[PDB]
Design a protein around this motif. Sequence first.
Motif, PDB file in Angstrom:
ATOM      1  N   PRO A 406       0.802  -1.232   0.000  1.00 26.52           N
ATOM      2  CA  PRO A 406       0.000   0.000   0.000  1.00 26.52           C
ATOM      3  C   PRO A 406       0.834   1.280   0.000  1.00 26.52           C
ATOM      4  CG  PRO A 406      -0.016  -1.005   2.171  1.00 26.52           C
ATOM      5  CD  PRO A 406       0.561  -2.020   1.225  1.00 26.52           C
ATOM      6  N   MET A 407       1.989   1.258   0.671  1.00 30.22           N
ATOM      7  CA  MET A 407       2.903   2.401   0.678  1.00 30.22           C
ATOM      8  C   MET A 407       3.535   2.688  -0.689  1.00 30.22           C
ATOM      9  SD  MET A 407       4.911   1.991   4.312  1.00 30.22           S
ATOM     10  CE  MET A 407       5.299   0.258   4.078  1.00 30.22           C
ATOM     11  N   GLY A 408       3.533   1.698  -1.586  1.00 29.06           N
ATOM     12  CA  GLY A 408       3.991   1.883  -2.957  1.00 29.06           C
ATOM     13  C   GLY A 408       5.487   2.114  -2.990  1.00 29.06           C
ATOM     14  N   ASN A 409       5.884   3.302  -3.448  1.00 28.40           N
ATOM     15  CA  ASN A 409       7.278   3.758  -3.395  1.00 28.40           C
ATOM     16  C   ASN A 409       7.539   4.764  -2.262  1.00 28.40           C
ATOM     17  OD1 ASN A 409       7.312   3.813  -7.052  1.00 28.40           O
ATOM     18  ND2 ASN A 409       7.726   2.114  -5.640  1.00 28.40           N
ATOM     19  N   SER A 410       6.500   5.122  -1.500  1.00 28.94           N
ATOM     20  CA  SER A 410       6.624   6.117  -0.427  1.00 28.94           C
ATOM     21  C   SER A 410       7.254   5.549   0.839  1.00 28.94           C
ATOM     22  CB  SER A 410       5.258   6.707  -0.073  1.00 28.94           C
ATOM     23  OG  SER A 410       4.556   7.102  -1.232  1.00 28.94           O
ATOM     24  N   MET A 411       7.691   6.453   1.706  1.00 24.21           N
ATOM     25  CA  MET A 411       8.121   6.100   3.055  1.00 24.21           C
ATOM     26  C   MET A 411       6.881   6.041   3.935  1.00 24.21           C
ATOM     27  SD  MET A 411      11.564   8.391   3.445  1.00 24.21           S
ATOM     28  CE  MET A 411      12.036   7.495   4.923  1.00 24.21           C
ATOM     29  N   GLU A 412       6.982   5.339   5.064  1.00 24.90           N
ATOM     30  CA  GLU A 412       5.822   5.100   5.938  1.00 24.90           C
ATOM     31  C   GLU A 412       5.202   6.400   6.429  1.00 24.90           C
ATOM     32  OE1 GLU A 412       6.072   1.751   8.595  1.00 24.90           O
ATOM     33  OE2 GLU A 412       4.510   2.524   9.913  1.00 24.90           O
ATOM     34  N   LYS A 413       6.035   7.262   7.010  1.00 24.55           N
ATOM     35  CA  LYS A 413       5.608   8.579   7.504  1.00 24.55           C
ATOM     36  C   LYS A 413       4.929   9.399   6.408  1.00 24.55           C
ATOM     37  CE  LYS A 413       5.377  11.987  10.501  1.00 24.55           C
ATOM     38  NZ  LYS A 413       5.400  13.236   9.687  1.00 24.55           N
ATOM     39  N   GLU A 414       5.530   9.381   5.220  1.00 21.79           N
ATOM     40  CA  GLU A 414       4.995  10.077   4.046  1.00 21.79           C
ATOM     41  C   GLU A 414       3.620   9.541   3.651  1.00 21.79           C
ATOM     42  OE1 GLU A 414       6.955  11.967   0.070  1.00 21.79           O
ATOM     43  OE2 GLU A 414       7.586   9.920   0.564  1.00 21.79           O
ATOM     44  N   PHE A 415       3.488   8.220   3.627  1.00 18.53           N
ATOM     45  CA  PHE A 415       2.230   7.568   3.266  1.00 18.53           C
ATOM     46  C   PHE A 415       1.117   7.771   4.309  1.00 18.53           C
ATOM     47  CE2 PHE A 415      -0.570   3.797   2.840  1.00 18.53           C
ATOM     48  CZ  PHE A 415      -1.048   4.068   1.569  1.00 18.53           C
ATOM     49  N   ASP A 417       0.945  10.385   6.399  1.00 22.26           N
ATOM     50  CA  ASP A 417       0.573  11.795   6.184  1.00 22.26           C
ATOM     51  C   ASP A 417      -0.440  11.916   5.046  1.00 22.26           C
ATOM     52  OD1 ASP A 417       2.292  12.616   8.215  1.00 22.26           O
ATOM     53  OD2 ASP A 417       3.750  13.552   6.880  1.00 22.26           O
ATOM     54  N   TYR A 418      -0.145  11.261   3.926  1.00 20.91           N
ATOM     55  CA  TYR A 418      -1.078  11.196   2.798  1.00 20.91           C
ATOM     56  C   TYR A 418      -2.450  10.628   3.228  1.00 20.91           C
ATOM     57  CZ  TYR A 418      -3.457   8.899  -1.106  1.00 20.91           C
ATOM     58  OH  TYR A 418      -4.411   8.420  -1.971  1.00 20.91           O
ATOM     59  N   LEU A 419      -2.454   9.516   3.975  1.00 22.43           N
ATOM     60  CA  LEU A 419      -3.713   8.923   4.477  1.00 22.43           C
ATOM     61  C   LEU A 419      -4.524   9.916   5.316  1.00 22.43           C
ATOM     62  CD1 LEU A 419      -2.609   5.296   5.539  1.00 22.43           C
ATOM     63  CD2 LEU A 419      -3.796   5.912   3.430  1.00 22.43           C
ATOM     64  N   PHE A 420      -3.862  10.633   6.228  1.00 24.84           N
ATOM     65  CA  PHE A 420      -4.543  11.634   7.060  1.00 24.84           C
ATOM     66  C   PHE A 420      -5.040  12.842   6.252  1.00 24.84           C
ATOM     67  CE2 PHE A 420      -4.949  14.964  10.351  1.00 24.84           C
ATOM     68  CZ  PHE A 420      -5.809  14.300  11.222  1.00 24.84           C
ATOM     69  N   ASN A 421      -4.222  13.354   5.329  1.00 21.92           N
ATOM     70  CA  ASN A 421      -4.671  14.415   4.406  1.00 21.92           C
ATOM     71  C   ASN A 421      -5.878  13.973   3.577  1.00 21.92           C
ATOM     72  OD1 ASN A 421      -2.596  16.193   5.198  1.00 21.92           O
ATOM     73  ND2 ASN A 421      -1.217  15.463   3.584  1.00 21.92           N
ATOM     74  N   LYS A 422      -5.823  12.740   3.080  1.00 21.92           N
ATOM     75  CA  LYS A 422      -6.947  12.127   2.364  1.00 21.92           C
ATOM     76  C   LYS A 422      -8.197  11.993   3.257  1.00 21.92           C
ATOM     77  CE  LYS A 422      -7.240  10.879  -1.226  1.00 21.92           C
ATOM     78  NZ  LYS A 422      -7.946  11.130  -2.512  1.00 21.92           N
TER      79      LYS A 422
END
Length: 455
Positions: A406-415, A417-422
Motif C-alpha cells: 500500500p505504501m507503494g514507493n513512499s516512506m511510511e511517515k509520508e504515506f 501523512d497522505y492517508l490523514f490528508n486524504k
Amino acid sequence: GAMAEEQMRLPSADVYRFAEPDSEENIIFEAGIPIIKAGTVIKLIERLTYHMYADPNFVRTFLTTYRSFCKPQELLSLIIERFEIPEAELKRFRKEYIQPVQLRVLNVCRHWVEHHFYDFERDAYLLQRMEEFIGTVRGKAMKKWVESITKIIQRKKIARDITFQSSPPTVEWHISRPGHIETFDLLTLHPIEIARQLTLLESDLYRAVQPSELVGSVWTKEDKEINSPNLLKMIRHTTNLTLWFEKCIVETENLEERVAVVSRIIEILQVFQELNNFNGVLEVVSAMNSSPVYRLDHTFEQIPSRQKKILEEAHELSEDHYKKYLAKLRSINPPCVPFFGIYLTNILKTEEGNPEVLKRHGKELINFSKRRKVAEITGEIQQYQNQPYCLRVESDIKRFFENLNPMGNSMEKEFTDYLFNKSLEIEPRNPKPLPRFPKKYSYPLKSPGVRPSNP
Ligand SMILES: COC1=C(OC)Cc2c(nc(C)nc2N[C@H](C)c2ccc(-c3ccccc3CO)s2)C1
C-alpha cells in the motif's frame, strides 16, 4: 584441609580459567538447582557445563539468549577451552571431573546444532570449526555423542536445501472468479476467504519466528535482516495489511461506498474471531483506530449497530493491559494465531526496564535474569506454534496478500501523512461542509455475508 583438597584436586588458575572459586565478585544466584541471577561469561560457561548435575533449563535459556552478551565465535572457543581440561588421583579426577564436564560440553553442542543451527547456517567458518572439534574427540562414552551430534548436523545439512485430519471446507468466491487475479480486491474477493487466507498466512508467519530473533532488541539493530528475518516478515505483514485496510477506506471518497468498505473489513474481523486469529482481529482494530480512519464520524454513523458493537468489543480486548484478550486466549482451544504485538511490547519493556550488567565488589557481571525473562516471553510464543488450521490454501489469494504494498514507493511517515490528508479531504473538520464524491466501484457492493457453504 578437606576444602583445599577439593580445590587442589581441580586445576589451578595459571593453567585453567574455569575452576576459580565461586564468590560474590563473579557469580550471583537468586533448595535444589540454583537459579543464576548474574555473573561473568567465564562463570556462566562453567555453570552451563557443570559437573555435579545437568541443568536443562539453563542450557535452553543460555543458547536462546547468549548472543545478547557473547558472539557465537566467542562461545564456541570458550566451550572448547572448557573441554580441554589440563591433566589414583588421576583416575578419580578423570572419573568425577574430566569425563562429566566433557559429557556436558557435548550436550551443549548437541543442543546448539539441533535447536540453533542458523548460527552455523549463517557463519560457514563456525560450522567447520564445530565439526573439526567433534572430529578430534577420543573416548569410551564420548563416541555415541559424536555420532548423535553428527547425525543432527547431517539432518540440518539436507534441510538447508500438507495433510489434513478433517475435511477442510470449500474455498469461497464472490465477484472475482478462480484465476481472475487482476480483479482481486477487498470487495471482489469473498470476505470469509480473505480471513481464511490471511489466517493461514499469519499462522505460518507466527510459526516461523524463532526465540533468538526477539532477544536484545536485535530486530532494531544494524544487523536485523539476518538476525531477525521471520520476525521482520511478521511485523512487515502487519504494517502492510493494516495500512492497506486504511488505504482501502480513505481512498473510497464516496461515503456510501466507504461505509461498505468498512463494513466488509468488520466482516473480515468477524471471521478472524471465528478462527481465533487474534493477530488478525487486532490488525483490523489498529486500522480502525488509526488517525485517518477513527476520525471518520460520518462513516461510523452508517455502520450497523451490531457491527459497531463487534468493533467496540474488539477494542476492549486491548484495555487494562490486554486483560480481556489474555482471558479470551486462555479460554479457547486450538487452532489459534495469538496477537503478536503484545510479546514485542513486553519484551521491549523488559529490555528497557532492566540493565545489561550488575555491579558487585567493583566488577560488571552480565545480567542473566534479564535474558531468562525475555526467554520466558518467547516460551509463551512457542506454546502456540504447533496449531495447523484445517483450511485449504488458495495460491492466488495467498500471493495477493503476500505482495501487498500500500505504501507503494513512499516512506511510511509520508504515506500515513497522505492517508490523514486524504481523511481530511473526504470528511472535513467542522465547521466546514461535507462534499459529495462520485462512485469509484462499478460492481455491486452488497456483501455475500460470513455464513459459509452447506445450507
Ligand atoms: C480511548 O480512545 C478510544 C479509541 O481511540 C482510538 C478507540 C476506541 C475506543 N473505545 C472503543 C469502545 N472502541 C474504540 N475503537 C473501535 C475499534 C472503533 C469503533 C468504531 C470505529 C470506527 C471505525 C471506522 C470509522 C470510524 C470509527 C469511529 O468514529 S473504531 C476508545
